[PDB]
From a paper:
TPADO is an α3β3-nonheme RO, which catalyzes the NADH-dependent dioxygenation of TPA, the aromatic subunit of PET. TPADO forms an α3β3-heterohexamer, in which three catalytic α-subunits form a trimeric head-to-tail assembly atop a triad of noncatalytic β-subunits. Like other ROs, a Rieske domain containing a [2Fe-2S] cluster and a catalytic domain that comprises the TPA substrate and ferrous ion binding site were located in each α-subunit. Residues H210, H215, and D356 coordinate the ferrous ion in the active site, which is 12.2 Å away from the [2Fe-2S] cluster of a neighboring α-subunit and connected via the amino acid side chains H210, D207, and H105.
To understand the structural arbiters of substrate recognition, we determined the crystal structures of TPADO in the ligand-free state to 2.28 Å resolution and ligand-bound structures with TPA to 2.08-Å resolution and 2-OH-TPA to 1.95 Å resolution. During model building and refinement, clear continuous protein density was observed outside the α3β3-domains and identified as a single lysozyme molecule. In a rather fortuitous crystal packing, the lysozyme protein effectively acts as a crystallization chaperone that “glues” the TPADO molecules together, a function that, to our knowledge, has not been previously reported for lysozyme. More specifically, one lysozyme molecule forms interactions to five TPADO molecules and binds to both α- and β-subunits. The mononuclear Fe-coordinating residues H210 and H215 are located on an α-helix spanning residues 208 to 220. In the substrate-free structure, H215 does not coordinate the ferrous ion, and in all three α-subunits, the helix conformation is the same. From residue H215 onward, this helix is disordered in two of the three α-subunits, while the third is stabilized by crystal contacts with a symmetry-related molecule. The TPA binding pocket is more open within the substrate-free structure because the α-helical residues from H215 onward are disordered and not part of the model; in total, residues 215 to 227 are missing.
Author numbering:
A (entry chain H): 1 to 129
B (entry chain E): 3 to 222, 226 to 253, 269 to 420
C (entry chain F): 3 to 214, 227 to 247, 269 to 411
D (entry chain D): 4 to 214, 228 to 247, 268 to 410
E (entry chain B), F (entry chain C), G (entry chain A): 1 to 154
Amino acid sequence: KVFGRCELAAAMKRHGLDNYRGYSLGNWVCAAKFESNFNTQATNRNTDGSTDYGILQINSRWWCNDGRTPGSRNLCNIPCSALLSSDITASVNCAKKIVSDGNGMNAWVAWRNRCKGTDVQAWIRGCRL
Amino acid sequence: ESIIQWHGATNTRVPFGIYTDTANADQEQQRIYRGEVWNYLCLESEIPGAGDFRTTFAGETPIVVVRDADQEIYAFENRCAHRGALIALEKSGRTDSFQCVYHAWSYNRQGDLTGVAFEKGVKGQGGMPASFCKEEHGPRKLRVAVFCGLVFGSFSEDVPSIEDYLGPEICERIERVLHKPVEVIGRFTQKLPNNWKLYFENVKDSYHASLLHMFFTTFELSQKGGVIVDESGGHHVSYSMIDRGAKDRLKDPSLLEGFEEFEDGVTLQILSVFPGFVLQQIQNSIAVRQLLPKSISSSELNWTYLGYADDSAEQRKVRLKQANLIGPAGFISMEDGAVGGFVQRGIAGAANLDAVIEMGGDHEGSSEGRATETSVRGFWKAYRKHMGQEMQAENLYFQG
Amino acid sequence: ESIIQWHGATNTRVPFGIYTDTANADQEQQRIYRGEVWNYLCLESEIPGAGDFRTTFAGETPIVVVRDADQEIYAFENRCAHRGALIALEKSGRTDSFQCVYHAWSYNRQGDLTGVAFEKGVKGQGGMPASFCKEEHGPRKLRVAVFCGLVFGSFSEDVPSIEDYLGPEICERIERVLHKPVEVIGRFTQKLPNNWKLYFENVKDSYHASLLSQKGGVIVDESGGHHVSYSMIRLKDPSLLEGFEEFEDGVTLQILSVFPGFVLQQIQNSIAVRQLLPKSISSSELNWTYLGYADDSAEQRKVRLKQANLIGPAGFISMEDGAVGGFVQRGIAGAANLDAVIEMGGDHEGSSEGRATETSVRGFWKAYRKHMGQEM
Amino acid sequence: SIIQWHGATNTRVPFGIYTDTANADQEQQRIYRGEVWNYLCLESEIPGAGDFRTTFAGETPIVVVRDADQEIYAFENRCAHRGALIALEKSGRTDSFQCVYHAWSYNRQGDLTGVAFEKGVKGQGGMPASFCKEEHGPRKLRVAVFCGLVFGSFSEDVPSIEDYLGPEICERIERVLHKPVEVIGRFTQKLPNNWKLYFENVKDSYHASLLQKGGVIVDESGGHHVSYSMIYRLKDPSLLEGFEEFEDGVTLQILSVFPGFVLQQIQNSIAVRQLLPKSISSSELNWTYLGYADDSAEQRKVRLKQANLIGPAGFISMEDGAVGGFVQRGIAGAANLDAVIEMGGDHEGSSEGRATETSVRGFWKAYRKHMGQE
Amino acid sequence: MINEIQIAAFNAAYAKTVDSDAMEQWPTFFTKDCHYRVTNVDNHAEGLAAGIVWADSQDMLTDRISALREANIYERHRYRHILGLPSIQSGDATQASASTPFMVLRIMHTGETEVFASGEYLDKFTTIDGKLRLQERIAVCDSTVTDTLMALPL
Amino acid sequence: MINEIQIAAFNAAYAKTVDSDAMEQWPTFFTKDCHYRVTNVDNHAEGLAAGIVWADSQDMLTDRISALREANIYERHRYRHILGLPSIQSGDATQASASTPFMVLRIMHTGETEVFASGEYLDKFTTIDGKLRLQERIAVCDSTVTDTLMALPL
Amino acid sequence: MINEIQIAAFNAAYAKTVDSDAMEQWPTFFTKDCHYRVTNVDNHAEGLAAGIVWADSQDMLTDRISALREANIYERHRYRHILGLPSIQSGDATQASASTPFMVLRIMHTGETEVFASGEYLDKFTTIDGKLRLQERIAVCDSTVTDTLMALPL
Ligand code: FES
Ligand code: FES
Ligand code: FES
Ligand SMILES: [Fe+3]
């Protein structure tokens, strides 16, 4: 599924990611923009044998189990396939565990490079919130 | 210390140990089930064609019963004469001959050893010694009798004829019900948490049955009843009947909506044959029961539900509705499964005490009315006869 | 060939056959459970009003126990004097009289046959002979005794009074706990994979219990049969052990036993009763009755509910009590001809200041051999 | 008496022998704790010091354990105090054993090394002066190891395993256990039959032949045998695709040692069985499936495919679980009758045929000897 | 379409009704002119019609429960239904034919737990006022044996 | 709305945790101020409050498992949970009350398999950081009898 | 994506196939190159590879059933599978690993009903030409003990 910007904002708010561990809704929307382009099926093989899954591009060596990745830690205790659904529940719950690990949202490369300290709140403007 | 001590020559007192003593149970196997009795095996209509067989039990002892090409029925012990394996492993089937799966010994439908795998060695090496003869080895064959389609077997050649064993009164009461071709309409088994004897006493307990039937007509025509007992004591009939042509709750009354099909007023007829056969007619509900012992405190009750082959759709439907009266969930017979157990458990600390059976006096013969235990005392007259438990020598000397 | 051969007169040696011989078990039924003992039946508070009854066991033998209008408690064997069926089929209830369902014989609350269905026939046909008399047929009645809310039953005319049976030291130790009305707050049953004797030994095993600034002791009545084990002055939720003062001594633990299967226990504010029944040579049943006092506040009751985690089938303290019996049952499988060794605290079968002793265990066997005619 | 032998011959076995509970208790004191070797485990299953397992010699639970000296010891699993099991685990590794009931300590030989509160607490209670640790202990077993097979006996008087086995069966064991073996699976079968029925069945060449060139050998006692054999379509014939690894032609060798050890080779399928009695009409069969430590991937795969022939679902051995029960149930009315065992005559020695019951009669020669039933 | 989830939900409510001894609600799961039968695989294989329980109207179900309350004597016990997933054989928006595996434990008041019956419900479902009802349920038991007696229906 | 599928999934994860001996994860299924109790239908029918296990905090659950590891002695065994469909009594988007049937097999290390307990979980669910947690679970057992002892919670 | 609903449906059909003695349809559930194994928790914990049943092709499954029909002699009996919810352990866009709890009752023709096995299916699923198939199923049994024999696969 390709989300609309505001659709995804509304779904992230209704899952309580607004100000979650410091981070306003716009950070989460901006992160998904530059991680996956709002595509729940986004999939990126790394040369390290790991893959990044779903709308928040969650890594298969640390966070979810894809059955293909040597040294899986599977710290969200989920198969990676649950991060490829039309429904963002499992992706958000794993995110909440990732952002709580305490490197904050720096965990999301594309969020550092393209979102950190920008006007974040822009990704939420013009949305029924 | 013998907990099998009979009080006197009368059956008004039963030692509770009779339901507990394991040595006494093994005697029941040798002296009753493999003694001068007829064991109910199956209906002839359940093995109609040549080769059709069933497996069942006479007491502890497994049995094959089979139709041959001659249209006669045979039965033999289900024990290979080699090292003792069951021969037939199936509840039922059709076969030309039986074969032990262990070492492929062949038996004909009479139970004769017809074949021994490698009898004559392999390349003149091993096999049976020259002294060995097939015809000297075989399972025990049973004398078979078929009476109104009921197939019975005895291990004794000397057992009286089924007609003499039953007596004329019971012969007629069976013919009354099995007067036409019957059709099996279902089978169910109950595992009873009680010694076999407790269930068979209960079949014969007219006191219990009248108590319950009397309770059942607090709900919804004057009836008289009676209890017949053969000369041996072992067989009974409990009946109830209207006088055809006298004057004078349920959301679906159809359960009791019956139809007339015997030339008499008999609404209920429960017939028993020592040591474990029951034939019943309750309105239009016809059935056979086979009672087997399993363990000192367990027994098996096998129901064969019956229709008549000539039943119309509507007549058969009536028997299917009335089946709700009988079997494991019967409006009438439900409690019959549990009361045996209530006794088994009530006597746990009373192995040395005696049951009291005085209803209708000392007698072991027929009676008008059902507030009696004559058919129960009859069971024990027959039992003690077969078990050699009449007054002994020493105790007879002292009394006389 | 006899595996129930005692080594000496001393009780430092128990033949392992005692836990296996089936003939010996049937003697235990005749000589102990239906002999000169008091069998625990129930609490008086479980049958408060007239007609309130329970069913239970005295050894193998099922029992009815019931309150009558006179406010007295009666007990009789749960066996119909007709053909032997259980009379009362329910764990508990209230009734005017008992009736065997098989042929509708009626019994009053004393266990007297008051009624025989169709005694006089139906339309002058059958019924009982003229010579038959209701008052000559009946279940064996039990003598009942009460002590501070505990109901006991005996089959023996000759059994001493409950006060004489218990003795004065055990009488005082019971009254200490049961000095007020108690209220049942839960029941649980454990099926133990062991001969009853192994669990009762274990209740009395101060040696075992001490393995799981306080001084303790062990009291034994004159017969040997009854004991008291006593004790007196990391967790994320220490509230489990947050107690309150309610005994006018310092005693934090009192485990009391009465031959052949009664336990009363006080562990801080955790009060309970146990009934031990034999079931088969290698199985027994333990019935727990957890207790509050009727006058308990909300906060006091909460404490007993938290402290209950110490006791019962999953008890921090009592969990293992379920299994050790079985460990013995299985360890002795090839040793029916050998003897248990019970020498801790000497030959003694009386009270001791230590708890590193087996005096209360040897006591059990003194009382056992007395009842079983096994002394020498 | 349903355990009355007809004559001295063993062509007739009283069916009561499978039923009499008094006779079973005699089997415990005269066979399992008599002049026999009971199979315990493989030495490779307890390789390192402290490595132990628990099992049974008849009814009697047993601990078997490796010590620092690299020797193996075995003792009755019974605390010398009040009789509790000492070791509660199928297997593990320990410095010493401790009874959980009252914390008595035992070394790996089964010696009592420690008694909780032996000397009282504050000079109160404890053991009398007369009590001596070294006078109390579980029965220790004589241990023997032969090609890695660990056996235990209660009897000082029992011969050595080489003398017990005899030379023919010693060589037949060495044949297959000639190298280091590796456990590749365990499975247990609960058999609804008296132990004797399954052990007879292991020895029953008559049965096995029904289910080209072969023979049956029997030791001098009668108790041990070897059965041996040599040379719709399968969509995957790979199940029988084998490889050569014995210096003879023998594609099947089934070896038994009184009263409950089996070693088998069926093509490339190697396994050991332990037969324990449990109740008059139940027994336990413990399978230890084996590879050789030096197996290649492809050789191991062959043993994994050929294992489908053996154990609880074996194309060959499935029936072996049930036939005992078939006999137990067929004789339910015949406690007073006799089994007929005349195939190959009265003989209780080796034969070139397999249409014989000589190894079965051998079992009963050995049985009656141990039980004083000649 | 009537589906696997709707039947599963229906089955769990049926089970809770029977297991909670709210037996008076049990006939409400059936149509007025329903069929209910307890039988076994042997009878079902040979085409034999008789049942331990046999009913061809909801009223007959109501009478069986009257008799349980007011007539039958039996030692106290309860059922614990453990159910598998339904399989639908055929069906449209309003009828469906389905099979559901079952296990029933029996727990005696004295505390013994036993597997009392197992098998499958051969069901015919219909839809009345938008809700699922049984036109037909045949409890086909795996065992020919019932221990002691059958008081409560499956 | 919290639904039957979400509770079923929660129940299967609870079951796997207890059945896999991952007992340290078991308290994480409960709120800080939760109630957990193992009782039976006799106690529940009277209103008797005692449990074989009785806990009114997650910390009490944690201590019970510490004691299982550090203190309690018992013969090795595992549980196999077979669960029914949850039936929801009340609930909004965040709370729910529900009953779930259960059966627990006990398998000893020696291989014996027995029905060890059966009954229903009377549950109160809440939602913490968008996940289901038990505010309350009462394991109401069908039998008054526990075989040998209870080491692992239900 | 392979999901919990698809595996549930697959598991119910697998169960029905084995429990109905339609054993010829049993290999249809597997890929050509599949692995099937019956083992126990002890073997699975110690890394031991052997099975009571061991197959590395659909053809070997087909042969096992040929031999059951044509060759193997065993006393008549039937299975009753009660399954739990599948729980997906791993997956990508096309493959999935899952665990499904199971209990198998064995019912003899003579009527005895026993818990014959329990454990979990450790499964590898794929989806080929629109059909969900087992690449792998390991029946990991909770007990080291099989009663009498194992004729039918789990
Ligand atoms: S036992 Fe029947 S052929 Fe050998
Ligand atoms: S047995 Fe009690 S009234 Fe007959
Ligand atoms: S029984 Fe072993 S220490 Fe007491
Ligand atoms: Fe064989």
